[PDB]
Amino acid sequence: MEIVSKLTLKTIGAQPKPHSVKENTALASIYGRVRGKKVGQSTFGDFIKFEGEFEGVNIATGEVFRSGALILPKVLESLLAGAVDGENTVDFAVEIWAKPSEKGNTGYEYGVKPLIE
């Protein structure tokens, strides 16, 4: 089990290269306990650093990762930010997918579903 300072689709090794997603592709399973969040700033946009305890699995490789921080793609970050707006602690378990999309920077969008689904 590798420890990463931030759990992200990139640090898990599961971010597809641009224009490589031609069908729905399962990327990672993420198990989380969220107990805080901080806004982070980068040159070309802000993001939320979720804090707590996270475990991620790269579905294609089987590799397992652990972290105290989580950063999600924008569409999923907004979903989790709502879900943690009214509860002091949130536990979750989700699977993240890439779906083919309109031509953009990457040609794919992110989807998410509960692992229990």
CA–CA dist 5, 25 (Å, integer): 25
Query: Domain count of the chain?
Result: 1
Yes or no: say if 87 and 35 are a contact pair by the CB < 8 Å rule: no
Host domain of residue 40 = 2-18+28-95
Are 21 and 99 contacting, i.e. CB atoms less than 8 angstroms apart? yes
Q: Is residue 63 part of a domain?
A: yes
In a domain, 114, yes or no: no
What is the residue type of 73? P
**d(C-alpha 28, C-alpha 58), whole Å:** 5
Q: What are the angstrom distances between the C-alpha of 13 and each of 8, 35, 53, 60?
A: 9, 25, 19, 9
Neighbouring-strand partners of residue 108: 100
Distance CA 105, CA 62 (A): 27
Resolution in angstroms comes to 1.7
H helices of the chain, in order, are 74-83
